[PDB]
Design a binder for these strands. Structure first.
Ligand SMILES: Nc1ncnc2c1ncn2[C@@H]1O[C@H](COP(=O)(O)OP(=O)(O)OP(=O)(O)O)[C@@H](O)[C@H]1O
Ligand SMILES: Nc1ncnc2c1ncn2[C@@H]1O[C@H](COP(=O)(O)OP(=O)(O)OP(=O)(O)O)[C@@H](O)[C@H]1O
Ligand SMILES: Nc1ncnc2c1ncn2[C@@H]1O[C@H](COP(=O)(O)OP(=O)(O)O)[C@@H](O)[C@H]1O
Ligand SMILES: [K+]
Ligand SMILES: [Mg+2]
Ligand SMILES: [Mg+2]
Ligand SMILES: [Mg+2]
Ligand SMILES: [Zn+2]
Lengths: 617, 616, 190
DNA sequence: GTGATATCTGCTTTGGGTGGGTGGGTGGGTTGAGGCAATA
DNA sequence: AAGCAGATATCAC
C-alpha cells in the first residue's frame, strides 16, 4: 500500500515530542496528563502549541500547514503513547486538542486558502444542537463469503466496503453493518455568530457552523463568547450522492458515478478540536486543595484576624462613605445561613434577604453594583422589567409551533446566587404575587396553558427601594414611607434606611471622596484584603455548617420572647428564623463550627435595630 | 469458571452454549432460593402475586441479584439483550413449575430490572453507553396509542415464520390471521423542568415500550426509565447533518414513577400485617393526626382536617342517576407566618398524585383544561389541566385570595360535579376531575380581625365558600407561654435537622404512613348502614338557625353531605368497613368546632353554650 | 465605489491654539440652526465625551424637550451625520429600526452605537418595555437578553441624544417639565 | 474460455390529498379564525 | 417520460 511519507514523519516526531518534552520542573509534562486518560470518560489530550513550537519548529509548521491531512496520525501517536497502561481497552479512541495558537483570524478571513490548515477564531454561540453518535470506522460482514471487513473509513456519507477483502471474493454490493464492532464518536453541531466587537460597521452578522467532537460536546452554551481552535473544511451535499448501501435522497460539479446526472455543491464548516472561553460535590478539604499554598495561608490569616468583620466591610465597599451598618448587613447576607430539610421532606430557608430604602442619590445602587461585581453568581435587575418574564417566569407562545414555553425571569437566572433588584417598589402585580413563594418557599409554580412546572429560585435578594413620596419622612415609620405590603416586609431579614443628611460636613466628605476617586483611580482605593482574597475566603467559609449550641438556644428563645412581648406589621416566627439565620452567618464569617452566644448577640443587635426602625419614626 | 473470558467479549461469551446453560441454571437457582432478611422466599410470593393477577412480568431488584449472583449482575449491563432472554426462559420454567396450567394464560414471562445503580442524566448519554443497560429519568411529553407491531410474520402457499427486529423491514402479502403481533408504544422523555438550567432548552430522548410495558406511563409523568441504549442508521439524519450520524432510542425494560411512590400491589404481606396491627391500636387516630407535618408546633385542628382530607370519603350513586362526591376540600385562612404554605408543601410531599400551584401562577384553562392549536394535523385538540391531571389526587392552591377572579371561578364545576365541561372550537366534551382541593388564603388587610366574622374577613363569596367541607382559621395571638413553647420547638427543629445529623403520642414514620394511606384508600370502602337521623337532623336545623342570625358563614345541604364524608373518612382511618357511632360523633365535633371559629369574639362564648351538648 | 497627516495635525493644533476654539467649533457644529448657542455647546461637549477612567460612565446624555416646529430633528440629524459610530432611531414601536435586541442574534441600535451616539427622535412615544431597556442601558451600560435559549450581556457604552415633545398640542407654562412630557422622573434623572 | 461492456427490463418517480391523520411536522405546502397569556 | 439498479447476453483477447 502506498505510504504517505509526510504524515508518518509527523507521527514519529509527535510521538517523540510527547515522550521527551520537559516542563519547567524537569518532569515529562504530558506523561502526567496522559496518565489521566485511563478513565472511561476521558479521551482527549490538550497540548499547548507553544510547547510544540519550542520542541520542534519544523514539526509545528508541518502540522499547521497539513493539519487535516496529518491529524489522524497524531491521534495514532497518542494511542501509541497511551498503549503501555493496561487499563485502556484496545477499542478506545483518543483525540488531540491544541490549546494556545499564537495567531487569530476573523470569521470573514475564512477563505478557501484556509481549507485544511490549523486556525483559531472567536465567536458568540447562537445555537447548540443535541449530541449524536457519529460513525468513524465501520465493521462489515460479507454476505457472499462471511468474511469480516474492518476499518472502513467514512466520508460525510454512509460508506460500505468497495471490494471484499478476500481475494477470491468479487462482491461489490452486499454487506452488513455490525454496530457492536464499529467505532463511533460523540458529535455536536453548534451555530456561532460574529461578536459585536468584530462585526464590521453597518454589516449584517455572518454566521458559521462548528462541529464539536468527543469531549468538546456540550462545552459551549448559547450566548457565550468562545475561542475555537480547529480547521476549516468543505462538506458536500450528501443528498445528491448515491452509494451501494444508500440511495440518493431528494451549480456544482458534474461527472461522478455516484452523482448520476446531478450536481454536487459544497459549503464551509469549521471542525473544532478545542473550545475555550474567550475571556476566562464541594467540601472544605477540596476547596483547600484547589488553592495554592500562598492562598491557603492567606485564607488562614484572614480567618485568624480579630478585626475581620470591619476589614471585610471596608474592603468590600471602599467608595461609599459612612453607612457601616448597611455594609455589615450586606456582608452577612453574602455569607448566608444553613439551609436544612425536615424529616418529612420540607425545606427550611437558609438564605438572607436585605432591603435598603433610600433618598435619591444616596448610593443604594452603589451597594447593589459592588455586590454584583464581587459575586461570581449574581444578577442585577430592575423591579420594572423590559421582558414579560420580569423577576419570575412568563409563558410565551412560539408562533410557528404554537407551543407555550417558559421564559425565565431574574430570580430564576440567579438561582443558587444573589439577585440585586433595583426599584423594588415598581414591581407589577404578577411579580408581586409570585415573589411571596419565591422569597419564602424558594420556588415558582406555574399551571398555565401547556405548562405545568415548579422552578427553582434558591436566591438571596438584595433590594433597593424609594419612599412613596420620593423623600423619606422621619416623622413617619418606615412602614409608612414605603409601599411594600406587610407580608412582603416580613420576608426580609433586614431593613436599612439611607437619609440625605442636609449637613455641610457630610457633603464635604462625600464630595472629597468622589473627587479623590476620579483624580487618582488606582491610588484612591486601599483594601486590607484584595477582592480575590475575599472571594477565596468566602468560598472556603461557605463550606462550614455551624451547629447551634444549648446556650445559644436559650439566648435565642429569650430574645424572641422579648421581641414578641415588646410588640399590620407584627413579630412572627419569621423573625425567629431570621435571627437563627443571622447567627449562623455570623458564626460562618469566622469559619467556626458552633454558633456561640457572641454571634447571637451581634445578630440580635442588627435585627433589633432593623425592627425598631420598622416600627417607630 | 464463568467469570474468565477466553479472549471473547461478554456478548460472545454469553452467546455460546456452555456459559448460556450455566447462566440459565444460576438464574433459576437464584429465583428458587433467594430469601430476605427475615428468611422468606421472596420470589415464591412475587410469582404467586403475578399469577393471581394474571400478569406476565416478574420484577427483579438488581441489588439482590448482585448480592447472590455477582457474575450475572456484572454481565447484565454489558450484554443486556442476551441475558434478559435467558432470564425470561428460566423464569418461564420456574413459573410453569409452580403453576403448571399457567401456559394457557401466557407463553412468555418478562424479567424486568429495578434499582439499577448506573443512573445517568438525559444530557450525559454518550457513545460509550451504546448497547448497555442504562437508567435515566425525566418527564413524559409525548405518548402514542398502543399499536400492533409484527412479531412473527407469515406471507402468502404460506411462507414460513419470520422474526421482526426494531431496526429494518423483514425480507421474504402478509397473512393477518397467521401472523403474530405485539403491543408497541413510543414515548418521548424530556428533562424535568426543575433540573434544566434556567433559560436553557431541554434535551429529549425517545423510548419504545413493548408487550405488557405499554401504558406504564402518561404524558406529564415523572418517570425513571431503565432500558437499552440503541442506535440505528438513519438516512435523513445523515442528510440533515452532512455527517454519518446514527439515530438513538431506548428499548425500555423497566418504567417506574419513582418520586417516593409505592402502589397498592407492591405492598407485601408483612406490610399489610403491620398496617392491620397498627389499626388495632386504640390511639391510632391520634397517631395519624400527629403524623401530619410533624415539624410544625401544634395547629391540631388543621392537622386533623388535613388527615381527613387525605383519607377521603366514599363516592355514592344510589340508582345511577344521582352522583355525590366523596372528596373533602379544605380552606386554610389566617395570619401571615403561620406555616400554611408549609402544610401545603407537606401535603404535596406525602401524597401519591399532588399538583401544587400558586395565586397568579394559575390560569383558568391551566387549572381545568385547555385547547391547543396545531400548524399541520387537526387544528385544535383538548389537553388536560391541573384538575384533570390530579384526578383521584390532590390539588394545592397557595395564595388563593390573590388569584384573578375569572381564574378562581373556573374551579366551581370541578369542586362539586367533579368534572370539567369544555365547548370550544368544535370540541364539546366532559372530562373527569375527582380531586381534593386544599387552598390557603390570607385575610383582607393581611391580618385576621377577631372583632369581625369569617365572611367579613375574606373577599370570597358564598358559592365558593360553601364548596369547602372544612374551614380552618389560623390565628397568631401573643401569649408568653405559647411563644416560649413555639420558640423552643422551632430552635430544636433547626438543631435536629442539621445536615450533619401535643397529642402525647408517637407519630408514625412517614414511609409507614404512606403505606397505611394507600392501603386504606384502595382496600377499605366504609359503608354507611345506620345513623342517628334525628340527632343529625336536629343539629342541622340548629346550625342553619344560628347561621342566619349571625351571618358568619352560609349553611347549605352541602354541610349535611360533608358530615357524612367526614364520618366515612374517620372510619377509613381505622380500617373499618362500616361507619359507626364514634365516626359520626367525631364528624359532628369537627363541623361544630369549625363553625364556632367563624364567629366574632364576643359571640363565641354563646355559640359554645348553644351547641355544648354535641361538643361534649 | 461611488459615494493623521503631519500637516493635518499641525493645522488641528494651530486651531487648538486659538483663544476662542470652543465658540468656533460650536458655530461650525450646526450652521443652519439659529440662535441655540448653549444647546450647540452641550452637543459639542457630548461629541467629545469625558475620560474613560476604566476603574464610571464617561458618556454625556442630553435631552432636548420643546414645542413642535422647532429645529430638534435637524440637530439630531446633524449630530448623526457627524459621528462615525452613530445611530438615528425613533422611540415609536412601529419604527423601522429598533432600540432593543431581538437563528440570528440582532442587537438593537443602542448596542450598535456602543462607543458612539444614539439619536432618539420621538422619546416621549416609547412604550414601557423600551423605557426599561433605555434605563438599563443608561444606568449599567449593558443590555441583558435571555431568549430562545440565548443568555448574554451586550456592551452598550453609548451617549443618548434624545428629542421630546409635550403631550399637549403646545408647551404648557403652568406645567413643569415632568408633567409636560410623560416620562418617569427616574429616567429623566439620568 | 473469462473479463469487461453493451443491451435489455422493471421500479418509481410527482409532491397530494381516494395514501393516512393509528406516521411525524427537525421531511415539506398564505389566509383566515380561534384560543391563550400578557396586555392596556 | 426520464434515469438508476439489476440482470444478462455478447464481443475480444
Ligand atoms: N455616602 C456616599 N458616599 C460616596 N458616594 C456617594 C454617597 N452618596 C452618594 N454618593 C455618590 O452618588 C452617586 C451614586 O448615585 P446612585 O445612582 O447610586 O444613587 P441612588 O441611591 O441609586 O439614587 P437614584 O436611584 O435616585 O438615582 C455616586 O456619585 C456616588 O459616589
Ligand atoms: N431655530 C430654528 N433655526 C432654524 N430653522 C428653524 C428654527 N426653528 C424652526 N425652524 C424651521 O422649522 C422647520 C424645522 O422643523 P423640524 O422638523 O426640525 O421640527 P422639530 O423640532 O423636530 O418638530 P416636530 O417634530 O414637532 O415637528 C424647518 O423649516 C426649520 O427651518
Ligand atoms: N407553628 C410553627 N411551627 C414551626 N414552624 C413554623 C410555625 N409557624 C411558622 N413556622 C415557620 O415559619 C416560616 C414561614 O411560614 P410560611 O410557610 O410562610 O407561613 P404562611 O405561608 O402562612 O405565611 C416557615 O419556614 C415555617 O417553618
Ligand atoms: K402530510
Ligand atoms: Mg439608582
Ligand atoms: Mg404562604
Ligand atoms: Mg421632529
Ligand atoms: Zn466476500
Amino acid at each position: 500500500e502506498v505510504r504517505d511519507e509526510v504524515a508518518e514523519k509527523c507521527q514519529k516526531l509527535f510521538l517523540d515530542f510527547l515522550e521527551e518534552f520537559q516542563s519547567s520542573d524537569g518532569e515529562i509534562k504530558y506523561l502526567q496528563l496522559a496518565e489521566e486518560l485511563i478513565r472511561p470518560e476521558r479521551n482527549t489530550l490538550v497540548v499547548s502549541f507553544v510547547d510544540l513550537e519550542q520542541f520542534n519548529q519544523q514539526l509545528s509548521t508541518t502540522i499547521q500547514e497539513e493539519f487535516y491531512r496529518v491529524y489522524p496520525y497524531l491521534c495514532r501517536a497518542l494511542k501509541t503513547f497511551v498503549k503501555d497502561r493496561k487499563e485502556i481497552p484496545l477499542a478506545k479512541d483518543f483525540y488531540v486538542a491544541f490549546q494556545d495558537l499564537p495567531t487569530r483570524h476573523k470569521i470573514r478571513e475564512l477563505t478557501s486558502s484556509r481549507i485544511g490548515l490549523l486556525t483559531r477564531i472567536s465567536g458568540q454561540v447562537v445555537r447548540t444542537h443535541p449530541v449524536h453518535p457519529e460513525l468513524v470506522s465501520g465493521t462489515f460482514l460479507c454476505l457472499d463469503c462471511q468474511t469480516v471487513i474492518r476499518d472502513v473509513e467514512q466520508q460525510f456519507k454512509y460508506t460500505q466496503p468497495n471490494i471484499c477483502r478476500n481475494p477470491v471474493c468479487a462482491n461489490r454490493r452486499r454487506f452488513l453493518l455490525d454496530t457492536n464492532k464499529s467505532r463511533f464518536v460523540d458529535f455536536q453541531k453548534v451555530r456561532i455568530q460574529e461578536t459585536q466587537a468584530e462585526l464590521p460597521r453597518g454589516s449584517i452578522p455572518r454566521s458559521l457552523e462548528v462541529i464539536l467532537r468527543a469531549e468538546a460536546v456540550e462545552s459551549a452554551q448559547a450566548g457565550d463568547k468562545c475561542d475555537f481552535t480547529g480547521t476549516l473544511i468543505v462538506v458536500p451535499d450528501v443528498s445528491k450522492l448515491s452509494t451501494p448501501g444508500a440511495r440518493a435522497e431528494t451549480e456544482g460539479i458534474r461527472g461522478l458515478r455516484a452523482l448520476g446526472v446531478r450536481d454536487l455543491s459544497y459549503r464551509l464548516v469549521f471542525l473544532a478540536c478545542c473550545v475555550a472561553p474567550t475571556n476566562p460535590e464541594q467540601t472544605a478539604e477540596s476547596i483547600k486543595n484547589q488553592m495554592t499554598v500562598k492562598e491557603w495561608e492567606k485564607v488562614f490569616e484572614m480567618s485568624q484576624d480579630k478585626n475581620l468583620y470591619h476589614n471585610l466591610c471596608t474592603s468590600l465597599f471602599p467608595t461609599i462613605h459612612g453607612n457601616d451598618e448597611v455594609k455589615r448587613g450586606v456582608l452577612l447576607m453574602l455569607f448566608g445561613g444553613v439551609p436544612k430539610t425536615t424529616g418529612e421532606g420540607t425545606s427550611l430557608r437558609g438564605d438572607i434577604n436585605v432591603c435598603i430604602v433610600g433618598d435619591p442619590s444616596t448610593a443604594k445602587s452603589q451597594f447593589l453594583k459592588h455586590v454584583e461585581e464581587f459575586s461570581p453568581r449574581a444578577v442585577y435587575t430592575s423591579g420594572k422589567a423590559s421582558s414579560a418574564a420580569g423577576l419570575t417566569a412568563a409563558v410565551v407562545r412560539d408562533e410557528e409551533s404554537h407551543e407555550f414555553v417558559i421564559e425565565a425571569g431574574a430570580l430564576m437566572l440567579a438561582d443558587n446566587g444573589v439577585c440585586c433588584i433595583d426599584e423594588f417598589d415598581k414591581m407589577d402585580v404578577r411579580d408581586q404575587v409570585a415573589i411571596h413563594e419565591a422569597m419564602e418557599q424558594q420556588t415558582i409554580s406555574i399551571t398555565k396553558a401547556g405548562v405545568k412546572a415548579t422552578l427553582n429560585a434558591r436566591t438571596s435578594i438584595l433590594a433597593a427601594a424609594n419612599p412613596i413620596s420620593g423623600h423619606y419622612d422621619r416623622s413617619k415609620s418606615l412602614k409608612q414611607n414605603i409601599n411594600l405590603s406587610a407580608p412582603i416586609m416580613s420576608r426580609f431579614d433586614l431593613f436599612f434606611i439611607l437619609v440625605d443628611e442636609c449637613n455641610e460636613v457630610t457633603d464635604y466628605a462625600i464630595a472629597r471622596r468622589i473627587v479623590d476617586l476620579h483624580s487618582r483611580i488606582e491610588e484612591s482605593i486601599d483594601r486590607v484584603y484584595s477582592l480575590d482574597d475575599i472571594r477565596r475566603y468566602l468560598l472556603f467559609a461557605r463550606q462550614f455548617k455551624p451547629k447551634i449550641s444549648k446556650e445559644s438556644e436559650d439566648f435565642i428563645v429569650e430574645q424572641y420572647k422579648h421581641l414578641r412581648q415588646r410588640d399590620s406589621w407584627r413579630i412572627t416566627v419569621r423573625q425567629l428564623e431570621s435571627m437563627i439565620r443571622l447567627s449562623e452567618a455570623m458564626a460562618r464569617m469566622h469559619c467556626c463550627d458552633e454558633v456561640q452566644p457572641k454571634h447571637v448577640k451581634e445578630a440580635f443587635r442588627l435585627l433589633n435595630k432593623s425592627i425598631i426602625r420598622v416600627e417607630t419614626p | 469458571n464463568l467469570e474468565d473470558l477466553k479472549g471473547h467479549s461478554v456478548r460472545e461469551w454469553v452467546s455460546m452454549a456452555g456459559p448460556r446453560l450455566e447462566i440459565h441454571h444460576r438464574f433459576k437457582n437464584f429465583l428458587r432460593t433467594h430469601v430476605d432478611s427475615h428468611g422468606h422466599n421472596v420470589f415464591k410470593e412475587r410469582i404467586s402475586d403475578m399469577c393471581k393477577e394474571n400478569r406476565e412480568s416478574l420484577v427483579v431488584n438488581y441489588e439482590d441479584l448482585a448480592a447472590r449472583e455477582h457474575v450475572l449482575a456484572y454481565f447484565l449491563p454489558e450484554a443486556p439483550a442476551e441475558l434478559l432472554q435467558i432470564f425470561d426462559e428460566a423464569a418461564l420454567e420456574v413459573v410453569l413449575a409452580m403453576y403448571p396450567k399457567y401456559d394457557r394464560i401466557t407463553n412468555h414471562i418478562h424479567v424486568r430490572i429495578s434499582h439499577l445503580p448506573l443512573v445517568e442524566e438525559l444530557r450525559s448519554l454518550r457513545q460509550l453507553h451504546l448497547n448497555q443497560l442504562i437508567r435515566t429519568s425525566g418527564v413524559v411529553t409525548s405518548c402514542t396509542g398502543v399499536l400492533p407491531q409484527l412479531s412473527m410474520v407469515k406471507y402468502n402457499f404460506v411462507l414460513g415464520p419470520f422474526c421482526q427486529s426494531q431496526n429494518q423491514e423483514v425480507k421474504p402479502e402478509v397473512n393477518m390471521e397467521e401472523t403474530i403481533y405485539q403491543n408497541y408504544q413510543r414515548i418521548r422523555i424530556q428533562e424535568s423542568p426543575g433540573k434544566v438550567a434556567a433559560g436553557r432548552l431541554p434535551r429529549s430522548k425517545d423510548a419504545i415500550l413493548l408487550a405488557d410495558l405499554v401504558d406504564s406511563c402518561k404524558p406529564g409523568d415523572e418517570i425513571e426509565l431503565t432500558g437499552i441504549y440503541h442506535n440505528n442508521y438513519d438516512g435523513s439524519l445523515n442528510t440533515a447533518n452532512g455527517f454519518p450520524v446514527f439515530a438513538t432510542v431506548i428499548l425500555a425494560n423497566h418504567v417506574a414513577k419513582k418520586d417516593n411512590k409505592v402502589a397498592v400491589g407492591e405492598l407485601t404481606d408483612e406490610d399489610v400485617k403491620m398496617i392491620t396491627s397498627l389499626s388495632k391500636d386504640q390511639q391510632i387516630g391520634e397517631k395519624i393526626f400527629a403524623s401530619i407535618a410533624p415539624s410544625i408546633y401544634g395547629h391540631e385542628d388543621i392537622k386533623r382536617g388535613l388527615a381527613l382530607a387525605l383519607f377521603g370519603g366514599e363516592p355514592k350513586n344510589p340508582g345511577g342517576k344521582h352522583k355525590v362526591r366523596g372528596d373533602i376540600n379544605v380552606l386554610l385562612c389566617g395570619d401571615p407566618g403561620t406555616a400554611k404554605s408549609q402544610f401545603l408543601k407537606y401535603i404535596e410531599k406525602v401524597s401519591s398524585r399532588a399538583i401544587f400551584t400558586t395565586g397568579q401562577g394559575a390560569s383558568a384553562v391551566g387549572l381545568t383544561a385547555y385547547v391547543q392549536r396545531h400548524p399541520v394535523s387537526r387544528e385544535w385538540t383538548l389537553e388536560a389541566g391541573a384538575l384533570v391531571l390530579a384526578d383521584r389526587g390532590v390539588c394545592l392552591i397557595d395564595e388563593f385570595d390573590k388569584m384573578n377572579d375569572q381564574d378562581r371561578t373556573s374551579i366551581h364545576e370541578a369542586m362539586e360535579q367533579q368534572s370539567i365541561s369544555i365547548s370550544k372550537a368544535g370540541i364539546v366534551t366532559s372530562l373527569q376531575a375527582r380531586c381534593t382541593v386544599i387552598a390557603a388564603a390570607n385575610p383582607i388587610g393581611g391580618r385576621y380581625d377577631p372583632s369581625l366574622t369569617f365572611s367579613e374577613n375574606v373577599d370570597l363569596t358564598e358559592p365558593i365558600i360553601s364548596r369547602f367541607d372544612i374551614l380552618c382559621v389560623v390565628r397568631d395571638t401573643v401569649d408568653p407561654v405559647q411563644d416560649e413553647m413555639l420558640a423552643r420547638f422551632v430552635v430544636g427543629s433547626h438543631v435536629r435537622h442539621h445536615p450533619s445529623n401535643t397529642y402525647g403520642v408517637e407519630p408514625l414514620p412517614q414511609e409507614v404512613l404512606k403505606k397505611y394511606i394507600i392501603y386504606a384508600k384502595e382496600r377499605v370502602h366504609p359503608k354507611l348502614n345506620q345513623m342517628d337521623q334525628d340527632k343529625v337532623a336536629k343539629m342541622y336545623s340548629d346550625l342553619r338557625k344560628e347561621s342566619m342570625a349571625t351571618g358568619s358563614i352560609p349553611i347549605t345541604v352541602r354541610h349535611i353531605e360533608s358530615m357524612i364524608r367526614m364520618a366515612e373518612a374517620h372510619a377509613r382511618i381505622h380500617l373499618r368497613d362500616y361507619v359507626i357511632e364514634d365516626d359520626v360523633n367525631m364528624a359532628i365535633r369537627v363541623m361544630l368546632e369549625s363553625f364556632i371559629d367563624t364567629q366574632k369574639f364576643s359571640v363565641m362564648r354563646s355559640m359554645r353554650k348553644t351547641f355544648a351538648r354535641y361538643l361534649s | 465605489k461611488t459615494d493623521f497627516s503631519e500637516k493635518r495635525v499641525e493645522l488641528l493644533k494651530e486651531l487648538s491654539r486659538k483663544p476662542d476654539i470652543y465658540e468656533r467649533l460650536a458655530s461650525a457644529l450646526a450652521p443652519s440652526i439659529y440662535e441655540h448657542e448653549d444647546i450647540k455647546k452641550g452637543i459639542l461637549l457630548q461629541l467629545f465625551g469625558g475620560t474613560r477612567k476604566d476603574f464610571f460612565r464617561a458618556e454625556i446624555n442630553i435631552l432636548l424637550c420643546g414645542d413642535p416646529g422647532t429645529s430638534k430633528s435637524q440637530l439630531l440629524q446633524y449630530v448623526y451625520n457627524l459621528v462615525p459610530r452613530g445611530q438615528y432611531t425613533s422611540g415609536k414601536g412601529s419604527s423601522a429600526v429598533g432600540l432593543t435586541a431581538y437563528l440570528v442574534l440582532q442587537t438593537g441600535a443602542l448596542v450598535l452605537s456602543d462607543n458612539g451616539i444614539c439619536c432618539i427622535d420621538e422619546f416621549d412615544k416609547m412604550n414601557e418595555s423600551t423605557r426599561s431597556v433605555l434605563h438599563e442601558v443608561m444606568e449599567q451600560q449593558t443590555l441583558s437578553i435571555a431568549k430562545a435559549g440565548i443568555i448574554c450581556q451586550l456592551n452598550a457604552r453609548t451617549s443618548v441624544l434624545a428629542a421630546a415633545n409635550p403631550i399637549e398640542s403646545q408647551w404648557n407654562p403652568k406645567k413643569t417639565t415632568i408633567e409636560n412630557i410623560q416620562l418617569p422622573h427616574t429616567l429623566l434623572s439620568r
